[PDB]
């Protein structure tokens, strides 16, 4: 894969209860490093990872200002969208944005991203060529025309190919001790009798990073996909992740089941048994 940086913006209107609230979080791969909340008393971009704390006041002032500007811009956008869709000012609406870069082994941009969603639906996205847009509907085509005329794609391309990957490389080096270190899962199998006839085997993967992982049960070397309960990968709360997979087995057949774990932190794929 490739290392990445992403910013996630969320603005939500609240008619009758003031202006829309803007929230921003930034990630390097699966590690959050900054946050901003427009409802805060003194709205500031704040550190969220140890390796970003070293950045100077100029960094925090600049990014705080951009977030303040983005707060106002999103409020204009929300107003604008309401008009495009002929919606009243009574209902709450949501605007989301994700953007960022993937850096390649040469240290150059591997792929750039910049996409928007309105009320949970794809609205407009910058294509991989970073020079054109994909608009979801007629409303988004109005936005497209504005952004074409304003040469938005070019400006973003410049950011993505330069600033973005430059700072990403910086973060990766400053936080190398954690960001460029893969923590393999601590794994085990538990056994939970359901009756005299069956029991649950649950395969655990705990304390791993990054979040990407594969957990599978096999019986006699055959995949048990459609019989396995796979929970969504979840945060431990300490910057690492958790996941488990479970299968119901006939009593006395436990030995025929094997759990298989793939993760970039492992020397090699694991096979587990009860």
């Amino acid at each position: 894969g490739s290392h990445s940086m992403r910013y996630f913006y969320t603005s939500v209107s609240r008619p009758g209860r003031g202006e829309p609230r803007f929230i921003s979080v930034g990630y390097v791969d699966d590690t959050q490093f900054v946050r901003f909340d427009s409802d805060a008393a003194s709205p500031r971009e704040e550190p969220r990872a140890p390796w970003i704390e070293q950045e100077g006041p100029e960094y925090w002032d600049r990014n705080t200002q951009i977030c303040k500007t983005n707060t106002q811009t999103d409020r204009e956008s929300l107003r604008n969208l309401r008009g495009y869709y002929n919606q009243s000012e009574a209902g709450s609406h949501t605007l989301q944005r994700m953007y960022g870069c993937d850096v390649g082994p040469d240290g150059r941009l591997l792929r750039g991203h910049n996409q928007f969603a309105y009320d949970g639906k794809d609205y407009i996205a910058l294509n991989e060529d970073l020079s054109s847009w994909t608009a979801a509907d007629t409303a988004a085509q109005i936005t497209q025309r504005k952004w074409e005329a304003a040469r938005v794609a070019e400006q973003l391309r410049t950011y993505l190919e330069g600033t973005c990957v430059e700072w990403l490389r910086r973060y990766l080096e400053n936080g190398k001790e954690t960001l460029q270190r893969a923590d393999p899962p601590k794994t085990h199998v538990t056994h939970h009798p359901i009756s005299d006839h069956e029991a649950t085997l649950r395969c655990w993967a705990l304390g791993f990073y990054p979040a990407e992982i594969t957990l599978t049960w096999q019986r006699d070397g055959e995949d048990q996909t459609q019989d396995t309960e796979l929970v969504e990968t979840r945060p431990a709360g300490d910057r690492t992740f958790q996941k488990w997979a479970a299968v119901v087995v006939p009593s006395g057949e436990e030995q025929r089941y094997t759990c298989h774990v793939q993760h970039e932190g492992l020397p090699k794929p694991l096979t587990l048994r009860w």
Partner: peptide
């Protein structure tokens, strides 16, 4: 953050 400002 990107310092490019354009309302939808």
């Amino acid at each position: 953050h990107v310092a490019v400002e354009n309302a939808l």
